[PDB]
Structures are given as C-alpha cells and as structure tokens.
C-alpha cells in the first residue's frame, strides 16, 4: 500500500485515517488488509504527519500575534521541511522501480525524522506558551540552539541565522 | 509457521503483533495458548522476545530524552548516537521483511542466526543504558571510559564511537 503512507505523511485526510483539519484525528482501524501490528506503526507514522500540519498553520497565520521577526522565523522553518519534502520525492521513485516493496524502509526514513520533528515541535510549543513578541523569539531560539542533537542544533542555528539577517538589515539601514 | 514469522517483526518493531504478550519487562514472552502444537515454538519466540524487549527500552529512553537542554549538554548527545544505533536496528529489520513476501526458506531457525548477530550488538547497548540510569555530563565521560578499558574490539569499537562523541 505504497502510495497510501507517503500521502498519509503529507498531512491530508482520508476515510481510513479520517482527519478533519489541522488538529484532530480518528484512527478507524476495522481494516482487513493490515495487521494489528501494522496499524500500530501507522500511528507511529501519523505522529510525524500530525506535527507537519501543526506547522503549516504556523505558516498561514504569519504568511499570506504580529511582528517583523515572526515571518523572519518562517523562512527559517521552510528550510527544515525542504530536505523533508526532498525525501518525499525520493520515496516516489522507490515505488516506481519496484511497486512491491513493503513499508519498513518508509518506517526507516521516518525514524530518521523521529528526532528532528518532535525536537522542533517542543520548540514551537515553548514559543507559543510564553506569548513571545519581537527580539525575544531570537533569544528563545538561541537557548534552544544552545542544546545539542547535532542535526537539530544546526537546524535551530539556520533558523537563528535568517532572523539574525533581519537584525543585520536593521543596524545596516540605521547607520 | 509463516504467521509466526510475521509475528516476530511486529514485536521487533515495537509492542505485540498477532496475539497479546502482556510483558513489558524481563522479556516479552510470547503466549499462543496452544497445547497440541509442538513444544519448540515457545522457545524460539522467547529469543524473539529479548530482542523486542531490548528494543522498546531504547525507544522509551528516547521518549525521556526530550528536554530544552536540561542538566547537561552531554546527556542527549549520548542519546543522539543511541538513536543512530537504534537506526541500525531498523535497517536490519528491512532485510527481514523482504524475505517474507514474494518478488529462501521461511523457517524460524535460519532467521535465528540473522538475529544472533544483532544479539551481540543490542545486548552490549543494554549494558550502556544500565550504567547511566542517573547521570550528569562529565560523569558520562567516566562511564564510557570504563567501558573502553575492557578489551575485545567488537563492542570496544562501539564504545569508542561513544567515547569520541560523549567527549565532543
């Protein structure tokens, strides 16, 4: 069921995985052609698509509170979905070279995202629970990039570097 | 036969598959509730239990890993390598399922040695997580250096990755 799981990963609803929009989920497993083990991993695979649409609502609220650094933080977050979406199209040719490969390699690529996607979701939840506004998102992400997780500490430094460029804009025009 | 080959992967991936096994700890021992069958399936699915019991202990360690970066810069970077060694277990599960479908023999004895080589990889990871139940950065460097003083460059290479990465 190769195409059903890449597209449950993009965040769009179904009637096996019934989804209303952007916050709510019903699992609906009265399914005959998956095993009781194999629906447990689809719940493991949906938890990495749940935070991906908890992410686009953070985009459309700021793109398309307030502040000039909120959307400066948005072109930081598009770079963390960019190898994510680059990995979504490399799974597409995997399903065309042989359309009989089972789901465990797709589980394997998403255990790679398993420590990037919650570790940024705990960041935005700590962001929205202090009700931050202005430069102090940049200080919040600076003590978040104080943390380790070497793929993630570069990622919160890339989100740091783009809104430091908007800081870099300011004292250039002011002088 | 084949339904037991499918049953081991789901406990290899996590918690119980076809039947209920009701064992978090000490091993995830597999009960089928059958007496008229041979007595030589319960022991093979007790070897498949210790591989799945030791898998979910690594996964619950990564669930407790989630901090801002609390009481140590060393503590979760230890677990960053342990997610890499969790990642190596999943690729060895990706060779098993490609045996299962049609595109070798589907017997329980052949896959035992295919899991016996992860059994020397995962069980020395269980010694690495037992040593640091309560811990602090700087004391992690005294944990992995006590593990590299043992000889035998099989896991001594593996703790030398952790020695070079705890120290970093």
């Amino acid at each position: 069921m190769i195409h059903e799981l890449l597209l449950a990963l993009s965040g769009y609803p179904g009637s096996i995985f019934t989804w209303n929009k952007r916050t709510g989920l019903q699992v609906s497993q009265d399914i005959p052609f998956l095993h009781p083990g194999e629906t447990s991993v689809l719940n493991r695979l949906c938890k990495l698509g749940t935070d991906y649409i908890r992410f686009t609502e953070f985009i459309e609220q700021y793109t398309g509170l307030h502040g000039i650094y909120l959307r400066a933080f948005c072109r930081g977050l598009d770079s963390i979905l960019q190898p994510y979406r680059q990995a979504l199209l490399d799974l597409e040719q995997e399903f065309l070279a042989d359309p009989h490969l089972s789901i465990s390699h797709i589980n394997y690529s998403l255990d790679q995202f398993h420590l990037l996607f919650p570790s940024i979701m705990v960041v935005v939840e700590q962001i929205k629970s202090q009700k931050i506004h202005g430069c102090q998102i940049l200080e919040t992400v600076y003590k978040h990039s104080c943390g380790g997780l070497p793929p993630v500490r570069s990622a919160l430094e890339k989100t740091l570097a783009v809104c430091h460029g908007v800081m870099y804009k300011q004292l250039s025009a002011w002088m | 036969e084949t339904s037991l080959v499918r049953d081991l992967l789901y406990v290899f991936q996590g918690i119980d598959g076809k039947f209920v096994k009701m064992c978090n700890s000490e091993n995830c021992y597999k009960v089928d509730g059958k007496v008229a069958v041979s007595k030589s399936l319960k022991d093979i699915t007790s070897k498949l239990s210790e591989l799945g019991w030791l898998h979910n202990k690594i996964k619950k360690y990564t669930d407790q890993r989630s901090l801002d970066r609390a009481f140590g810069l060393v503590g979760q970077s230890f677990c960053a390598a342990l997610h890499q060694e969790l990642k190596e277990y999943y690729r060895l599960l990706s060779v098993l399922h490609s045996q299962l479908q049609v595109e070798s023999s589907l017997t329980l004895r052949r896959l035992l040695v295919w899991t016996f080589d992860p059994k020397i990889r995962l069980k020395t990871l269980a010694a690495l997580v037992d040593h640091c139940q309560g811990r602090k950065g700087g004391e992690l460097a005294s944990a992995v250096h006590a593990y590299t003083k043992t000889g035998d460059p099989y896991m001594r290479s593996l703790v030398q990755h952790i020695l070079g990465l705890v120290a970093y």
Binding site: D98, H100, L101 | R91, S94, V95, S98, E103
Partner: peptide
C-alpha cells in the same frame, strides 16, 4: 559495504 550488499540482495530477489 554491508548496506550495499543488502540492497543488491533485495534487488536480485526481485529480478526474477
């Protein structure tokens, strides 16, 4: 080198 041999073993079984 073992990951490349595992990928070739998964492709040779699907070649027939």
């Amino acid at each position: 080198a073992a990951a490349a041999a595992a990928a070739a073993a998964a492709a040779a079984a699907a070649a027939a």
